[PDB]
Amino acid sequence: KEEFKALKTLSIFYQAGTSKAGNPIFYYVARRFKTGQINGDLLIYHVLLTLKPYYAKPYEIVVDLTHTGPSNRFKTDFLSKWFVVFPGFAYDNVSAVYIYNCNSWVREYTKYHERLLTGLKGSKRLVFIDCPGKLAEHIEHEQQKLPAATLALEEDLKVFHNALKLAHKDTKVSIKVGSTAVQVTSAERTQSVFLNDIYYASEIEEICLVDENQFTLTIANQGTPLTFMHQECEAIVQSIIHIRTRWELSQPDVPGTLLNIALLNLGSSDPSLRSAAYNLLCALTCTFNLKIEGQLLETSGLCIPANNTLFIVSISKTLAANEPHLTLEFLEECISGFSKSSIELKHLCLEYMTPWLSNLVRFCKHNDDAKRQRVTAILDKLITMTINEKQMYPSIQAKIWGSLGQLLDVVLDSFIKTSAIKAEVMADTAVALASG
Amino acid sequence: VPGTLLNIALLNLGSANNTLFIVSISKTLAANEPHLTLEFLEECISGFSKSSIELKHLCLEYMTPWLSNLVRFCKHNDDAKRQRVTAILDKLITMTINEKQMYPSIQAKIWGSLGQITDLLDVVLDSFIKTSATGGLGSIKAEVMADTAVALASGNVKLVSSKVIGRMCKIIDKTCLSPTPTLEQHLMWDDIAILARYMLMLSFNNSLDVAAHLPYLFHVVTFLVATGPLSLRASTHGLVINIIHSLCTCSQLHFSEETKQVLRLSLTEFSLPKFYLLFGISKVKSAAVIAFYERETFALTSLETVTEALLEIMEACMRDIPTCKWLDQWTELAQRFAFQYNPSLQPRALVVFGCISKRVSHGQIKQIIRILSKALESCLKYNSQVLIEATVIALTKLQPLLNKDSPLHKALFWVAVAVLQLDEVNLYSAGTALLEQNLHTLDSLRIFNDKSPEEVFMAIRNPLEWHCKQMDHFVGLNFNSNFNFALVGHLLKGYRHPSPAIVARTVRILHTLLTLVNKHRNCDKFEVNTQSVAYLAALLTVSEEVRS
Amino acid sequence: VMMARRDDLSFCQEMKFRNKMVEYLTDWVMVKCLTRDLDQASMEAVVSLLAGLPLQPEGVELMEAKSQLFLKYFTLFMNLLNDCSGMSRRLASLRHCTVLAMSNLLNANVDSGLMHSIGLGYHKDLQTRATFMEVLTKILQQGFERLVELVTMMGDQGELPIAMALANVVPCSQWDELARVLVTLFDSRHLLYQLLWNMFSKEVELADSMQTLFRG
């Protein structure tokens, strides 16, 4: 009922204009559909009740793929449902589908769902629009009705040509900087089409100049930074920082946690707990692609020994080398788990923690005040543990404080400020710290 | 006094923190002044056991470097030096059992360091095993020792596991050096049970190990698979699960996606309730929980099932690893135990040898049928029956291997008949399996195509006829008078059999024979005649095709 | 039982209905024997209600309200398991059910749940931890192992053992989609003729006469 009048407010599908072949034109704006938020069936129905008065006669579709990502996808069962819901003639009466701003993700989506899209392969009705200008070869300029937000991306662009996107295979790209976004346009990718990956200022989490010829962009929710090479990187980076800053000034005002709970539970006296933990470690390894020696296999009923400390430790430090980004997230949660644990589980926590400590320098070499604060808070919690857990205390000193001794202003200020048994423990712990 | 005073000094030096300085001095003196080690580690454990938990952490930290020198004293093999290292290891073991809240600490630093040290590992293992021997399975001394054994392996996996598994194999062989009727009773049962405990713990670390070992581990599974108290059974199920998982991930191996998928599906299959019943586990949600008596009086058909599944695991792998000798080594190991006289193990071995083998000889068949005969002599004088069942299952698996022109295929049909005559439930099941597989074998050899089964089998009887007359006159069935009805007489008892599976097998055998008797005439299979009628009458309660 | 049948029933506002139902039944989660059976039953119902249930309070505030509602149910289940920590088996059954309640609550509500769920991961009870970690396992591989070969496996003489056994045991109601599943699958692997040759052969084989052939 009332929740259906809501889709017409979203306008993910709207009629607008007539083609140069005298047919009505309809726009699908992919990014406006959020999978899991709107009832698929509802959207489909709305598209039907939009096409009903027209789909008996020829008509054309413009699919605006601008900024389309995972959050806009059609799930397998939803995808296929699109190819059967309509009357056969409705499919036949599409004379042209204009595809605008197709991108790398959609391309990947196309290959992943190759099976359901076979009929679209090499279809003559799919016209990928090379650039905003070629849409006129099919639609009068005054006839074009792309969303205003799409058209905004096309103005006052600073263009850097002949950049190189670094990946298994390096690809030739253009890097374009607009006031609200970065657009990375690629040369012919498989029909042969130009792709346009769009990164709004708001999703550019970090920008880092590596060489005078190379920089990285970290994009919110994409895990792996994009890496580019270009002789004018200094200037590209400067213009992107400028755009990110502009966005910032305008604003009104799992791996680590789960990895600790896996590792610490592998310790347990309970056998079922060990098997479950081992499966969780496997799942984390696969999901977060965590690079591991002595490879890990998911399965039920795997009867792991109670004494496995040397295995847990081996996994941990291999991870500590391989997966440093985890370190802050992981260590803080481990130290919290220390306070929860039995003495046996506390001891085990020290052994597996020990490799991770080394990584903490990376975070205070990083200039982020929050990351420097989180290292400082980890050291405060390490101190808190060191004071509280007295039985462990000579052993804690040997593992933890020796390794930390290898920051040390921040360490000494944390000792002094905490001291300001606490003070005695900091003095006695400073002996270990000095050995490094 | 040198070791005593140096222990007193390092202990009291901590009594506050200078722990890494103490360790640096300890390292330095351990490298420089090795003779101190014998006295020092003895004195360390004496002071450790008396001291507080805080001092115990400190104590282990300073102990850690010294362990390396313990090999020096051992090279000589004169008692006194080797004995005091052996005493030091027993004291370190005792220390490990006692301090349940030092427990990961002791294992990681003391046992991980000792794990580096190859030479000593035989002394260490005999100390562990003798510590476990103090009460056998169920003794907390043994239980902790098994859990600790993984730490021993963690440094030099391949040698430690090779010695543990080697001791297991050698001790299983030692059972045959002085046989007992039943394995759980055996003079060395505790020694086996202890090593099986270690093997479970090791088996997850065997994810590093398996490639040299895999045959020997299945040899151990073969004897143990459902034996003993229920915790050892659970352990032995876990041992296989962990080995299959280890074969899916050993970083040294490179198995294909097909082979890996076969192993993944095997883990799934071994996780099923079917496999729990095979391993003599019943009335449990999870084997793991019990691993960390109601013997199903062991059914050899269960071992047969396990063994073919482990064979499909091994075969899948062996396609990918052309440079291995695994199935040949398993064949030799099983063969040795199958042929040698040992009432407890020999049946199990025969079953396995038969299942795994890829070739056989008339001299091996002679040994098997001689074992069957000797087992029937022992019945004149339960274990004997299980040996008979085993030999008959072995004959079942072995007979498809035999050469196409061998007399023995025809001979084994009469071995099956004689076995059915015995009237024992599992023997009859085995004889019908033998007979079922024998008739498939002889039909695959084309042998029926120009002769009745009656002529083929009765020819082999003709030399035997003097003996067969005495059998038939005491049985009260006479194949010379009418072959088809005598054979059917034997099969009819199969309809009584308590198991619906054996009844259905019996029906398949009758159907096979019906088809075969008419096959040499070129008749339709349901053509009633003086030869087919017996099978038709036998089939009358069980076949809708016959009835219609 | 109603939740098991939920796949059969019709709902205007299913998510709201289930949310309100958990809200009501959770009040009951607190003669002693009967109240403990009420706890067990209530929790078993709550485990059924929570099974793919997104939470819905009555946009940015809505996600935070959803998190606060998650925290209420989750805390109540934790308290119930702390209270747990024939009389013995009933308590263990209540505990197992409570763990499954948390599990299902998490499995749907990931964005609201994960942080509080780590608090389960710490929790003093090892059995609950283990189960919770299997729940995490479901989320993390959610967001090849998909062997259909076994269905398209052909025995000697082209038996198609799995499909033919599946054809004679599946209820007649699902026959309409079983044909859709097998035809699309075999055609995707260029074995359509093998499927048709096997199924058509069985029809003529059992058909009484030529006029019964493929009629009905």
From Swiss-Prot, chain A:
Detected in brain, peripheral nerve, lung, colon and muscle. Changing residue 355 to L: In a colorectal cancer sample; somatic mutation. Residues 1-158 form the CRAL-TRIO domain. Ubiquitinated by RNF7/RBX2, leading to its degradation. It is found in: Nucleus; Nucleus, Nucleolus; Cell membrane. It comes from the Eukaryota. Residues 1-253 are annotated as: Lipid binding. It is linked to Neurofibromatosis 1: A disease characterized by patches of skin pigmentation (cafe-au-lait spots), Lisch nodules of the iris, tumors in the peripheral nervous system and fibromatous skin tumors. Individuals with the disorder have increased susceptibility to the development of benign and malignant tumors. Leukemia, juvenile myelomonocytic: An aggressive pediatric myelodysplastic syndrome/myeloproliferative disorder characterized by malignant transformation in the hematopoietic stem cell compartment with proliferation of differentiated progeny. Patients have splenomegaly, enlarged lymph nodes, rashes, and hemorrhages. Stimulates the GTPase activity of Ras. NF1 shows greater affinity for Ras GAP, but lower specific activity. May be a regulator of Ras activity. Binds phospholipids via its C-terminal CRAL-TRIO domain. Binds primarily glycerophospholipids with monounsaturated C18:1 and/or C16:1 fatty acid moieties and a phosphatidylethanolamine or phosphatidylcholine headgroup. Has lesser affinity for lipids containing phosphatidylserine and phosphatidylinositol. Interacts with HTR6. Interacts with SPRED2. This is Neurofibromin. It comes from Homo sapiens (Human). The gene is NF1. The chain holds residues 1581 to 2041 of 2839 of the full protein.
